[PDB]
Amino acid sequence: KAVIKNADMSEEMQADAVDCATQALEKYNIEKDIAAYIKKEFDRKHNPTWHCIVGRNFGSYVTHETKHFIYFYLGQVAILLFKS
Amino acid sequence: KAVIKNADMSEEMQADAVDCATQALEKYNIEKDIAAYIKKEFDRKHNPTWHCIVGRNFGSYVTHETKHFIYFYLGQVAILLFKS
Amino acid sequence: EPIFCAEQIVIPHNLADILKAYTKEVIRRQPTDLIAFSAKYFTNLANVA
Amino acid sequence: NLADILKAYTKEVIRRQPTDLIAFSAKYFTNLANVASGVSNSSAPAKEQLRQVYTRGGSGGATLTESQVTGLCIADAVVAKVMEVDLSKFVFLCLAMSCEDFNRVCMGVFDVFDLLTLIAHLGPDMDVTPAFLDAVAAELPAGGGAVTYMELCEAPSLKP
Amino acid sequence: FEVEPILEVLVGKVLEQGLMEVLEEEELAAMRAHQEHFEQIRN
Amino acid sequence: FEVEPILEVLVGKVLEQGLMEVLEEEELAAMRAHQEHFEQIRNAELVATQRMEAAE
Amino acid sequence: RAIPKLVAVLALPELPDDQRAHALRVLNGLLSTQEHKTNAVAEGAAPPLCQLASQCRDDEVRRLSCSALASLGQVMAGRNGIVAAGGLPVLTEALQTTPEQAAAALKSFAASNDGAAQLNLERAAIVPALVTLLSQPTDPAFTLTAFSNALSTLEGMTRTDDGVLAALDGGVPACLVALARRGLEGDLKFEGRLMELLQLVATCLEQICHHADGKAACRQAEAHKVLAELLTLQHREIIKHAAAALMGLAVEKESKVNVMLYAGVSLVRLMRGSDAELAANARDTVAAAAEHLEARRTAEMLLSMEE
Amino acid sequence: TYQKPITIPGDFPAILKAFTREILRAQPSNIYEFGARYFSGLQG
Amino acid sequence: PITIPGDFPAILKAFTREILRAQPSNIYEFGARYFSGLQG
């Protein structure tokens, strides 16, 4: 499963983002490399300027291209994904 | 004081970022508040967009415009700041 | 300084000492659910304290 | 291969934890590489300065002799020679190359050990001449066989 | 869920420590009791 | 562009494993030192115990 | 907290042979890590590893699987769960294979127990089977590590349950005599860690000759050759445990008399020198074996007891 | 012969995991008050 | 007092990187000669 808290994204794209983030959080090991895999896959299948942040205590003030933003929990980390 | 852990800015920008962050921290405490203050100051000072992350534990993998990327600590609290 | 993972918890070796002394006292007589005896143990530990 | 050998290196260094990490790592890696060990323990080698074995080509059965040396652990050399029994020449050469001759090497070699081939081998360990051994024989007391140290040290009392 | 492992590690450590400590203390007490019995014998 | 990821995982897992293993092995060896000590003391008390049993 | 993914991949139906080894190594490293030790000892990760190891039906699979089960079983709660779920099936099947990993899998249980091998003892046939394994030689110098581990396991288990092992034909001094008769000399496996193996054998000898069943074992064995053979490497644990074994042999009039009378020069040399650490147990041996071969007291008096 | 130290924690696991759960949650400023009131509540 | 200080991270990283670049044929001469070169 997964939890999606705060979104600005189409539902199918949210489902794909959850699947991608789950495979990354499964296979990889370190938070920055989780971010790296998520960004590389959304780049290779949708669009170039992505940004990923997998954190456990952080607060940001971000600007994103419209209809591209997700802030969601999966397990023990908070993933932020936005296009810029 | 200020540990400039990983940056690719210039020196003038460096001092501007560091003293703006020092100014913000003595004003507020919430991550939202600090990130908001810092990035509003830097948007109104330099350029359209500025992604600011304020936190203590988090990764990242973000595409930056060259010479507009910084990642530094102020004691224990960490600030990522990059324009894209 | 909020916690990030399981590491940020701070309970000293004093708790380990508590537990070793407790275990010694609760296996010397083999009380096995000593709840009242443990309460009296705390009673006289306080009286000394 | 590479990964496991590097694993061994890492485990050993994370076992030590020195201060001058570069210098200590240099010294450690060099000692692991070369058979010549700077520690150079004697009377219980624990570090095969086997230049004698290199001269031997194996000192008999190489695997078996090195097995005996490794299973070894004055007294340790005596026990090693006892377990072993060529090989005696290698053992004496080890007990010499770990020492410095003052006729104490000869006395100790005899004790650990019938005293001719011992000196014959020990001459080559200098990398003298056999005429010195011939003079020692001309000076040899109790020439019937294996002499004692005190008995033999009669004419050549002042010797190295 | 964020504490379980620490729970377990202290639980096991104290288990073994208390076990062996009280065990050996009681054994030595019993043998000293037998010693004082032999002192009674030699009275 | 090959150094980064492979060496990252290699060095990281190796260093963490060493930092854990020295800890655990030293603790277990200390435990075995404990057991040797009190078992030797009780073995002396047990030869005394043999004298006890053969006393009659 | 992602050890469960590796756990599930390990316990998948018909655990394949693609890698099947690095997964187990990572899982063992986790279940060793003081955090992931709990994360694997409380999060299930069923003994299907043991079941597949039993249903190996291969050559290079069984060895790695048995090594994995071994490394997994050396924890308090892990071994408790293994016992509660029949891990003794694995601890018995592992002693069947000549490979070092499989052989030392059996010993790791008590080697970690240090007194909590009651599961192995209640599996009273498992100890005799593992004795039949680690007594017959096959590919030694690697089974020798398993031999030393099993010697430590015996040092614990016999000390806890003296009668339980002596009653078994493995034998408190009978296994010591078997170890001596083997000699473990081979070529390159004399006392690498087999010095410690002899140390643990002698410690179990003391802790078992403590009980009169161990005295019957000493009578049935007469294994002073073990001491006279393995006392030369000068291991501290070996010396102390062997002198304590001689001391506790006094229950066995037969073997104690034989050892205290027809001993080697080792006892005399130990008295002459300054081997203080072993000297306590050696003097205990002398005092308790002045009875068995009672001429020992007169022999000591003749051999400069006034020194 | 060798006395059996049957003193093994069988319900002590439950009780002590509960108690150390409480303390690890609590971070007691003083050990006494937390422990004693814990056992008083267990009484209750 | 068991924490391997900041050096061994960098030393290990550079060792691994350079042994990868050189691709040695005999595996263990490298570290000795390499540390000799790093000393001075």
I36 contact residues in D (CB cutoff 8 A): 26, 30
The DSSP letter of residue D125 is: G
Q: Looking at the partner chain, which of F17, F35, F46 has a beta carbon nearest the beta carbon of G248?
A: F46
Tokens for G164, please give them. Answer: 């339980």
Question: Closest approach of chain A CAs to the CA of C48, in angstroms?
Answer: 44
Tokens 């018909």 -> residue = G14
Nearest CA in chain D to F16: D14
Question: Closest approach of chain E CAs to the CA of C48, in angstroms?
Answer: 23
D70 contact residues in G (CB cutoff 8 A): 188, 192
Range of the structural domain that residue H18 is part of: 5-44
Q: Do B76 and C4 touch (CB under 8 A)?
A: no
Q: Which domains can be identified in chain C, with CATH numbers? A: 6-48 (1.20.890.10)
What is the distance between the alpha carbons of residues D129 and D133, in angstroms, rounded to a whole number? 7
Give partners of F (≥3 CB pairs < 8 A).
A, D, E, G, I
Q: Looking at the partner chain, which of E7, E19, E30 has a beta carbon nearest the beta carbon of H17?
A: E7
What is the distance between the alpha carbons of residues D59 and D44, in angstroms, rounded to a whole number? 19
Which residues 51-90 of D have a C-beta within 8 angstroms of G?
A: 63-64, 66-67, 70-71, 73, 79, 83
Q: Looking at the partner chain, which of E1, E9, E15 has a beta carbon nearest the beta carbon of G34?
A: E9
Helices (H) and strands (E) in chain I, counts: 2, 0
What is the distance between the alpha carbons of residues G85 and G75, in angstroms, rounded to a whole number? 15
What amino acid occupies position H7?
T
What is the distance between the alpha carbons of residues D147 and E8, in angstroms, rounded to a whole number? 71
Tokens for D24, please give them. Answer: 């200590």
G159 contact residues in H (CB cutoff 8 A): 2
Q: Do A26 and G1 touch (CB under 8 A)?
A: no
Q: Are there at least 3 beta-carbon pairs closer than 8 Å between G and E?
A: yes
Return the number of other C-beta atoms located less than 10 Å from residue C45's C-beta: 14
Q: Are there at least 3 beta-carbon pairs closer than 8 Å between H and I?
A: no
Interface of E with H (CB under 8 A): 3, 6-8, 10-11, 14-15, 19, 22-23, 27, 30
Number of domains in chain A: 1
The DSSP letter of residue G125 is: T
Contact of D12 with chain F, judged by CB distance below 8 Å, is answered with no
- The three-state DSSP-derived secondary structure of chain A is CCEEEEECCCHHHHHHHHHHHHHHHHHCCCHHHHHHHHHHHHHHHCCCCEEEEEEEEEEEECCCCCCCEEEEEECCEEEEEEEC
What is the distance between the alpha carbons of residues G207 and G222, in angstroms, rounded to a whole number? 16
Report whether I28 contacts D26 (CB < 8 A). no
What is the distance between the alpha carbons of residues G90 and G51, in angstroms, rounded to a whole number? 8
Picking from G178, G174, G257, G242, the residue whose alpha carbon sits closest to that of residue G214 is G174
CA–CA–CA angle D54, D58, D60 (5° rounding): 140
Which string of DSSP letters, residue by residue, matches chain B? -EEEEEE-S-HHHHHHHHHHHHHHHHH--SHHHHHHHHHHHHHHHT-S--EEEEEEEE--EE---TT-EEEEEETTEEEEEE--
Tokens 């299930």 -> residue = G44
Q: Do D5 and I8 touch (CB under 8 A)?
A: no
Terminal-to-terminal C-alpha distance of chain H: 43
F5 contact residues in A (CB cutoff 8 A): 33
What is the distance between the alpha carbons of residues F16 and D7, in angstroms, rounded to a whole number? 12
Handedness of CA G170, G171, G172, G173 (dihedral sign): negative
What is the distance between the alpha carbons of residues D149 and D103, in angstroms, rounded to a whole number? 9
What is the distance between the alpha carbons of residues B51 and B40, in angstroms, rounded to a whole number? 10
Distance of CA B30 to CAs B50, B60, C9, D151, Å? 19, 20, 22, 95
Tokens 């050469």 -> residue = D93
Beta bridge partners of B3: B73
Q: Are there at least 3 beta-carbon pairs closer than 8 Å between B and D?
A: no
What amino acid occupies position D112?
V
Tokens 């039906």 -> residue = G57
What is the distance between the alpha carbons of residues E28 and F56, in angstroms, rounded to a whole number? 22
Residues with Cβ within 8 Å of D49's Cβ and at least 6 positions away in sequence, in order, are D35, D36, D37, D40, D94, D97, D98
Nearest CA in chain F to A29: F9
Picking from G85, G113, G112, G90, the residue whose alpha carbon sits closest to that of residue G102 is G90
Range of the structural domain that residue A11 is part of: 2-83
Tokens for D51, please give them. Answer: 């230049």
What amino acid occupies position B69?
F
Q: Pairing relation of β-strands B69-74 and B77-82?
A: antiparallel
Give partners of A (≥3 CB pairs < 8 A).
B, C, F, G
C1-19 in b/e burial notation, b at 16+ Cβ within 10 A? eeebeeeeeebeeebeebb
User: In Å, what resolution does this model reach?
Assistant: 3.4
Report whether D95 contacts D112 (CB < 8 A). yes
Number of domains in chain H: 1
Contact of D5 with chain F, judged by CB distance below 8 Å, is answered with no
Question: Closest approach of chain B CAs to the CA of C5, in angstroms?
Answer: 10
